[PDB]
Design a protein around this motif. Structure first.
Motif, PDB file in Angstrom:
ATOM      1  N   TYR A  90     -30.856  67.069 120.900  1.00 11.56           N
ATOM      2  CA  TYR A  90     -30.640  66.387 119.429  1.00 11.56           C
ATOM      3  C   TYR A  90     -31.540  67.365 118.424  1.00 11.56           C
ATOM      4  CZ  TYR A  90     -27.115  63.228 121.378  1.00 11.56           C
ATOM      5  OH  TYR A  90     -26.424  62.594 122.412  1.00 11.56           O
ATOM      6  N   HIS A  91     -32.451  67.803 118.945  1.00 10.22           N
ATOM      7  CA  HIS A  91     -33.356  68.727 118.225  1.00 10.22           C
ATOM      8  C   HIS A  91     -32.916  69.961 117.499  1.00 10.22           C
ATOM      9  CE1 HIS A  91     -37.261  66.995 118.322  1.00 10.22           C
ATOM     10  NE2 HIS A  91     -37.260  66.832 119.595  1.00 10.22           N
ATOM     11  N   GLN A 138     -29.597  58.853 112.402  1.00 13.39           N
ATOM     12  CA  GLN A 138     -29.773  59.375 113.530  1.00 13.39           C
ATOM     13  C   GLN A 138     -31.344  59.414 113.912  1.00 13.39           C
ATOM     14  OE1 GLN A 138     -27.099  61.426 116.325  1.00 13.39           O
ATOM     15  NE2 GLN A 138     -27.927  63.132 115.609  1.00 13.39           N
ATOM     16  N   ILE A 139     -32.113  58.618 114.281  1.00 12.93           N
ATOM     17  CA  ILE A 139     -33.554  58.479 114.562  1.00 12.93           C
ATOM     18  C   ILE A 139     -33.780  59.429 115.701  1.00 12.93           C
ATOM     19  CG2 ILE A 139     -35.424  57.163 115.293  1.00 12.93           C
ATOM     20  CD1 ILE A 139     -35.213  55.418 112.745  1.00 12.93           C
ATOM     21  N   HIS A 148     -37.042  59.622 123.056  1.00 12.80           N
ATOM     22  CA  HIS A 148     -35.998  58.381 122.791  1.00 12.80           C
ATOM     23  C   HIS A 148     -35.233  58.738 121.761  1.00 12.80           C
ATOM     24  CE1 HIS A 148     -34.612  54.391 122.010  1.00 12.80           C
ATOM     25  NE2 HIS A 148     -35.363  54.047 122.951  1.00 12.80           N
ATOM     26  N   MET A 149     -33.740  58.299 121.758  1.00 13.17           N
ATOM     27  CA  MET A 149     -33.018  58.483 120.760  1.00 13.17           C
ATOM     28  C   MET A 149     -32.450  57.033 120.331  1.00 13.17           C
ATOM     29  SD  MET A 149     -29.916  58.556 119.399  1.00 13.17           S
ATOM     30  CE  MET A 149     -28.679  59.501 118.367  1.00 13.17           C
ATOM     31  N   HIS A 150     -32.268  56.742 119.262  1.00 14.48           N
ATOM     32  CA  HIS A 150     -31.732  55.561 118.560  1.00 14.48           C
ATOM     33  C   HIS A 150     -30.856  55.688 117.295  1.00 14.48           C
ATOM     34  CE1 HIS A 150     -31.655  52.139 115.662  1.00 14.48           C
ATOM     35  NE2 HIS A 150     -31.237  51.575 116.782  1.00 14.48           N
ATOM     36  N   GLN A 207     -32.433  61.925 110.419  1.00 17.78           N
ATOM     37  CA  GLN A 207     -31.218  62.823 110.136  1.00 17.78           C
ATOM     38  C   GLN A 207     -30.164  62.063 109.562  1.00 17.78           C
ATOM     39  OE1 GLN A 207     -28.695  63.957 112.952  1.00 17.78           O
ATOM     40  NE2 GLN A 207     -28.010  65.938 112.006  1.00 17.78           N
ATOM     41  N   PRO A 208     -29.883  62.413 108.187  1.00 17.23           N
ATOM     42  CA  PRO A 208     -28.610  61.662 107.631  1.00 17.23           C
ATOM     43  C   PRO A 208     -27.305  62.613 107.780  1.00 17.23           C
ATOM     44  CG  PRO A 208     -29.697  62.958 105.934  1.00 17.23           C
ATOM     45  CD  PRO A 208     -30.328  63.298 107.430  1.00 17.23           C
ATOM     46  N   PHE A 209     -26.120  61.769 107.949  1.00 19.30           N
ATOM     47  CA  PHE A 209     -24.980  62.397 108.557  1.00 19.30           C
ATOM     48  C   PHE A 209     -23.986  62.401 107.160  1.00 19.30           C
ATOM     49  CE2 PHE A 209     -23.492  62.825 113.073  1.00 19.30           C
ATOM     50  CZ  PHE A 209     -24.508  63.806 113.293  1.00 19.30           C
ATOM     51  N   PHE A 210     -24.587  62.858 106.160  1.00 19.46           N
ATOM     52  CA  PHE A 210     -23.643  62.703 104.916  1.00 19.46           C
ATOM     53  C   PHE A 210     -22.792  63.729 104.870  1.00 19.46           C
ATOM     54  CE2 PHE A 210     -28.103  61.874 102.833  1.00 19.46           C
ATOM     55  CZ  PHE A 210     -28.024  60.674 102.847  1.00 19.46           C
ATOM     56  N   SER A 211     -21.700  63.310 104.101  1.00 19.05           N
ATOM     57  CA  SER A 211     -20.252  63.989 104.371  1.00 19.05           C
ATOM     58  C   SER A 211     -20.315  65.479 103.846  1.00 19.05           C
ATOM     59  CB  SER A 211     -19.009  63.152 103.566  1.00 19.05           C
ATOM     60  OG  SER A 211     -19.109  61.867 103.658  1.00 19.05           O
TER      61      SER A 211
END
Ligand SMILES: *[C@@H]1O[C@H](CO)[C@@H](O[C@@H]2O[C@H](CO)[C@@H](O)[C@H](O)[C@H]2NC(C)=O)[C@H](O)[C@H]1NC(C)=O
Ligand SMILES: *[C@@H]1O[C@H](CO)[C@@H](O)[C@H](O)[C@H]1NC(C)=O
Ligand SMILES: *[C@@H]1O[C@H](CO)[C@@H](O)[C@H](O)[C@H]1NC(C)=O
Ligand SMILES: *[C@@H]1O[C@H](CO)[C@@H](O)[C@H](O)[C@H]1NC(C)=O
Ligand SMILES: *[C@@H]1O[C@H](CO)[C@@H](O)[C@H](O)[C@H]1NC(C)=O
Ligand SMILES: *[C@@H]1O[C@H](CO)[C@@H](O)[C@H](O)[C@H]1NC(C)=O
Ligand SMILES: *[C@@H]1O[C@H](CO)[C@@H](O)[C@H](O)[C@H]1NC(C)=O
Ligand SMILES: *[C@@H]1O[C@H](CO)[C@@H](O)[C@H](O)[C@H]1NC(C)=O
Ligand SMILES: *[C@@H]1O[C@H](CO)[C@@H](O)[C@H](O)[C@H]1NC(C)=O
Ligand SMILES: *[C@@H]1O[C@H](CO)[C@@H](O)[C@H](O)[C@H]1NC(C)=O
Lengths: 111, 403, 264, 111, 237, 93, 106
Positions: A67-68, C196-197, C213-215, C244-248
């Protein structure tokens, strides 16, 4: 139905000079895409393989999706010949199909 | 026939005329329109070789359906990632024309392919439904090697070691600008861009190791040949090149480029020199692998202690782990301890000439001073190496008796 | 690639009957050329312009400023077709200038304008002006081209356009961490897109990813659009945290506001 | 086929994504491609900005060029129209070409 | 500056009726400007050329190569004046190109050449083709100009040209220094040559009877005088 | 002489001795002079190649000529003088 | 006075110690001529065919050569007419410079 060119400034006649590798990047690339059969019964090419980037990230050497670093489709405007009026007649289009999927380093803002 | 030249043509049924108009023409079905008209019936395919490239050859069965001659046209579609193409084939059966029965078949010479390919068939106008034929091309027939260079023209790198130096000679051509890379099994070792043919000098200890060679062209096909598995001298050198490292007092690590099953056991080295005494029994051969951390059960170290490593049911490595930190060696004797039921404790002595129990009346060096050794052991003067509920081991200083 | 409005786009200047026309970007001169041709444009420049709308939208626009040539080929000049060609794409918008009046004099220097080409941040185009009619085959170019680079949201002026507002350029999620057995707190934005952290640990500057680690933070409800949310992360010195933002507007490629952990 | 009648009144079906949904990753991508200018006053389109790769592989996290994979150019089969010289029965002609619409980095066929 | 030969100076090419006349780089279209000014010429380039006078002499000559444009301004092209201007000293010579028939056809790319400009060795000549009519005040220049440098007599082909031969490009010094004595050669000119060394000596003018006869001087560079030189050309040593 | 008729059929009084060639001294001089073009499209001569040369008192050789200029239409010829530089010679300060 | 001779136009008229201090001295020559404008032209002809050093002696190593230019003069036509002129091109030797000769040998 048309036969000749008359009373139409943009009705033209076309001829025939239309003119085995590069077929495994769909998986071999770091940003794979699954081809979608966008089949239209009146559009040449009858099949266009749109790239739907299968994973949002890029797969590194270990095979685990990372995911990087993200992947974005490369779309491109193309000209296609949709039949009208539904002889052999056609009309152009500018459709934004997706050809490939290049994977990019994300934009990082520090603090 | 299986072999055709670098061109496209048609294999035409006898009696009927036949021609090609392929120009990657604009290929679309349209719509079915109603009306003795020629029409396709089935699709027949034979994997055929074009030279040099593999390409599926297709055939279209023909018949007469519907309600001084006969003419028709058959359009041959195509699809394969990422190629779309169309082909025109004209079939004209002389008035050999019968109703309700097959007339013949026409064949298209070559269709480039890699993998799945599908084909269709339309008359113009589309008198009936299009035919269908899918096909999954194999990735290995006996003719695959020689026909396509992608499988046979693998870049060559042959090696010689007659002069005890590993010399690798490149059998590639003169104008080639290829790639070379070396890895381990993956941690790469080295890489170089160089002109072939060329002689690269390697070493016997270096050859554990693997080599990859590939041309510097887009979509390079790289050959990773590792033919040194059969060579036993390579593994012998690797075992010789393998080194034992003592990380801490009670831990040790095995370092080697490759990992193989092995066993490790403790050992004792006398201060005299080359002679060395294994410590098994009472210890057991513990399984050990490369890059695996193992902790000794001993609570205290001793410079004279050593480790014996068994690989493939044979001793190959023997190093003084504690000498690099606890050296020089000390003239200390080793006494074996054992405990059993009813709080009974047993003690034995280890000597280069053999093992003797204590106390004893033997003429051996340890037996003569057995009582003094036991008194020193019970007084805490001696140093204990490892302890267990059923036994132990102690190191007793000797300078108080002779020196 | 679009026009800022579908209103009257008249290019009227003293003594000129020009009307901006909609066009597909192929000319009738391309199909049926004429022998006699005008000349190429001169001093064509493109500048970064912002233009509002009737709804308060702020669009970066391309201002096209080109000057006719003094030579006597103006008598056969019937207009100029514009173009703004995308870099990573092959999209073309091309509008036409049907000069209704026949220019016959050069008493003054003509400065020609067109400022209705909407552009995008962090994007590069190629703008060209092509007088009409087109040349005969194997003729002189009869046109001028230029490369138009539109800057990114980091520009103080781009940051407030609806492009850079829909992509959260003005977002100020000052992310901090606290030494726990860690907790990461960040402030969301006016959008219903999941967050998405990404957390990784670097023990040293040897660049080793010892722990990762992913959350996932779901799409926030309306009551928490501008609130701050704190999420703890399990740990196995430099523990990089990236958001990270998933903005449209950015499916998965936005400015990801990172963070770092000090050793003390 | 041989003679078809194509009405050049292009019908634009790229009428979507009028907001910003694109960027320029020619430089940030691990398989960068330097754009190339295709100029042809005899063809529609007259200008196509195809590409060409920058290396023979991807780039590692250290930023140095890596040879472990292959940067290969994604290519399409765009239909373009061309204007025939006067000594031809048809004034216009349709030709497909293979142009680099991008450049991805892919896993080698054989290790 | 000079024209090569005042012969039938034609520049016409098929389909056109060029008539070449003299000029002074002040066209009537500059005294009486006309609004419609034709576009500049395209691809101006100048190359060396050597033409043969009836007297058999060899004069370097500027060969100018320039072509028009395909735009509509060709209907307003009535001529293209050619200008040859010496730089260090401002002697200007111009010749008027005059196109009787209108160049209304773009069937073939018109290319015009002019190679009757006697170019001296080592002297640059800005060659300009001012299209006629000339521009209106504050307009597009519509003129092509380019420096045209020419090498000295040390050039291999130029050393056999009449201006270079008349300067002494083929004179062999053959100096001989051996009390000290020197000797030097002679060319058939009634000029007093010089030998310079810290000393100075003079040699009188050789009669026509010792055209190449060697001479010597007792107790090292040679400079001749000439018609093509009163003080300055190749100084042998 | 506010209004004087001048004939523009310029005759060349420079029919000098043809064997007298010329040299370019812009590099061989003790005070080499560089070359710069002066262009006014309302002037004859339209291009004048003045001199800008690089006890080194290399003073510019400066002499003025007559120039037939052009006047705006609201007034169209105005004969003037411009003090231009020919070359550059070295002098004792 | 414009007439059927178009190139005849009417115009409105608008309007130093180096020679004793230069390493290439020159002596000005007066070309007095009442028929042309200016009536006096000053022409510098080299005093010596070589240059003078700091001493001032003529050295044959350094050459003095007449730097000239083509300037303009207006001569009356017909002669002695104060309201007529003719535009003329003459060559004037403006000054003498110092240049090194091109020297080559074996
Ligand atoms: C940080 O996280 C803590 C988690 O305990 C939040 O504290 C609780 O938050 C919930 C809502 O998620 C409330 O219902 C509780 O009343 C809060 N307190 C307790 C004692 O549970 C805290 O709100 C978070 N920080 C911020 C700024 O929201
Ligand atoms: C796709 O790629 C993966 C990764 O190398 C490989 O394991 C798998 O076999 C591939 N599948 C196909 C159908 O090529
Ligand atoms: C192929 O064509 C046949 C013709 O009857 C049809 O039955 C079949 O469903 C088709 N296959 C696919 C995958 O559509
Ligand atoms: C390398 O070359 C030698 C000399 O021809 C040959 O005998 C040897 O078999 C080659 N090595 C291999 C592995 O074929
Ligand atoms: C421009 O249009 C107006 C509107 O009729 C017209 O009166 C005018 O003459 C036009 N301009 C020219 C230069 O003809
Ligand atoms: C003109 O084109 C724009 C897009 O370029 C479109 O939105 C608009 O509807 C068009 N108007 C007409 C009248 O065709
Ligand atoms: C961001 O800055 C504001 C400014 O006062 C502050 O109130 C807020 O706590 C900060 N957020 C953090 C540190 O996460
Ligand atoms: C969210 O807030 C920002 C300013 O804080 C504003 O510009 C934006 O329009 C808001 N979002 C919505 C959907 O109104
Ligand atoms: C040139 O002169 C010839 C003389 O016969 C004449 O016929 C022709 O029309 C003139 N013009 C041209 C060739 O353009
Ligand atoms: C042009 O001038 C030269 C030199 O003065 C002369 O020989 C020639 O006759 C002149 N030509 C015309 C047409 O006047």
């Amino acid at each position: 139905p048309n036969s000749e060119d008359k009373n139409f400034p943009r009705t033209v006649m076309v001829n025939l000079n239309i003119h085995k590798r590069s077929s495994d990047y769909y998986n071999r690339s770091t940003s794979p895409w699954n081809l979608h059969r966008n089949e239209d019964p009146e559009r040449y090419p009858s099949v266009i393989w749109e790239a739907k980037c299968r994973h949002l990230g890029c797969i590194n050497a270990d095979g685990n999706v990372d995911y990087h670093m993200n992947s974005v489709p490369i779309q491109q405007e193309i000209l296609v010949l949709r039949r009208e009026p539904p002889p052999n007649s056609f009309r152009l289009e500018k459709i934004l199909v997706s050809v490939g999927c290049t994977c990019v380093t994300p934009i990082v803002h520090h603090v | 026939e299986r072999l055709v030249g670098p061109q496209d043509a048609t294999h035409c049924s006898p009696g009927l005329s036949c021609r090609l108009w392929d120009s990657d023409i604009l290929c679309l079905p349209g719509d079915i329109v109603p009306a003795p008209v020629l029409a396709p019936t089935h699709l027949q395919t034979e994997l055929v070789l074009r030279c040099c490239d593999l390409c599926l050859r297709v055939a279209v069965h023909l018949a007469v359906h519907g309600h001084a001659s006969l003419q028709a046209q058959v359009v041959l579609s195509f699809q394969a990632y990422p190629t779309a193409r169309c082909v025109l084939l004209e079939v004209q059966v002389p008035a050999l024309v019968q109703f309700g029965q097959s007339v013949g078949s026409v064949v298209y010479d070559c269709f480039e392919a890699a993998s799945e390919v599908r084909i269709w068939s339309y008359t113009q106008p589309r008198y009936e439904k299009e035919l269908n034929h899918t096909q999954q091309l194999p990735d290995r027939g006996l003719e695959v090697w020689n026909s396509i260079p992608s499988c046979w023209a693998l870049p060559w790198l042959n090696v010689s070691a007659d002069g005890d130096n590993v010399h690798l000679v490149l059998n590639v051509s003169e104008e080639q600008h290829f790639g070379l890379s070396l890895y381990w099994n993956p941690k790469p070792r080295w890489h170089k861009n160089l002109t072939g043919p060329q002689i690269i000098t390697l070493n016997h200890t270096d050859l554990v190791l693997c080599i990859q060679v590939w041309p510097l062209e887009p979509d390079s096909v790289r050959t990773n040949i590792c033919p040194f598995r059969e060579d036993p001298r390579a593994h012998q050198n690797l075992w010789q090149a393998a080194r034992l490292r003592l990380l801490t007092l009670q831990s040790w690590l095995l370092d080697a480029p490759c990992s193989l099953p092995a066993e490790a056991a403790l050992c004792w080295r006398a201060p005299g020199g080359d002679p060395c005494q294994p410590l098994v029994p009472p210890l057991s051969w513990e399984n050990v692998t490369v890059d695996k951390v193992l902790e000794f059960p001993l609570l205290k170290g001793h410079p004279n202690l050593c480790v014996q490593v068994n690989s493939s049911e044979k001793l190959q490595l023997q190093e003084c782990l504690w000498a690099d930190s606890l050296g020089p060696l000390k003239d200390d004797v080793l006494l074996l301890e054992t405990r059993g039921p009813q709080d009974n404790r047993s003690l034995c002595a280890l000597e280069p000439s053999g093992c003797t129990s204590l106390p004893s009346k033997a003429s051996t060096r340890a037996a003569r001073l057995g009582e003094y050794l036991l008194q020193d052991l019970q007084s805490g003067q001696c140093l204990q190496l490892w302890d267990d509920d059923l036994g132990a081991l102690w190191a007793c200083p000797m300078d108080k008796y002779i020196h | 690639l679009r026009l800022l409005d579908h209103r009257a786009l008249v290019c009227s200047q003293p003594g000129l009957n020009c009307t901006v026309k909609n066009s597909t970007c192929l000319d009738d001169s391309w199909i049926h050329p004429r022998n006699l041709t005008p000349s190429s444009p001169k001093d064509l420049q493109i500048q970064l312009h912002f233009a509002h709308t009737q709804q308060g939208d702020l669009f970066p626009v391309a201002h096209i400023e080109w000057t006719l040539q003094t030579d006597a080929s103006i008598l056969y000049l019937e207009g100029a077709e514009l173009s703004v060609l995308q870099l990573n794409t092959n999209e073309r918008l091309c509008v036409r200038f049907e000069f209704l009046s026949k220019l016959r004099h050069h008493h003054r220097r003509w400065r020609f304008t067109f400022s209705h080409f909407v552009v995008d941040p962090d994007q590069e185009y190629e703008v060209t002006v092509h007088h009409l009619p087109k040349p005969i085959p194997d003729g002189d170019p009869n046109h001028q081209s230029k490369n138009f680079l539109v800057p990114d949201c980091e520009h103080a002026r781009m940051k407030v356009t609806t492009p850079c507002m829909s992509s959260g350029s003005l977002w100020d999620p000052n992310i901090t961490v606290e030494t726990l057995e860690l907790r990461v707190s960040f402030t969301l934005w006016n959008e219903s897109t999941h967050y998405q952290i990404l957390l990784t640990s670097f023990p040293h500057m040897e660049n080793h990813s010892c722990f990762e680690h992913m959350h996932h933070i779901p799409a926030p409800r309306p009551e928490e659009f501008h609130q701050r949310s704190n999420v703890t992360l399990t740990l196995r010195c430099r523990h990089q945290v990236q958001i990270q933002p998933f903005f449209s507007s950015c499916l998965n490629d936005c400015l990801r506001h990172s963070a770092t952990v000090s050793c003390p």
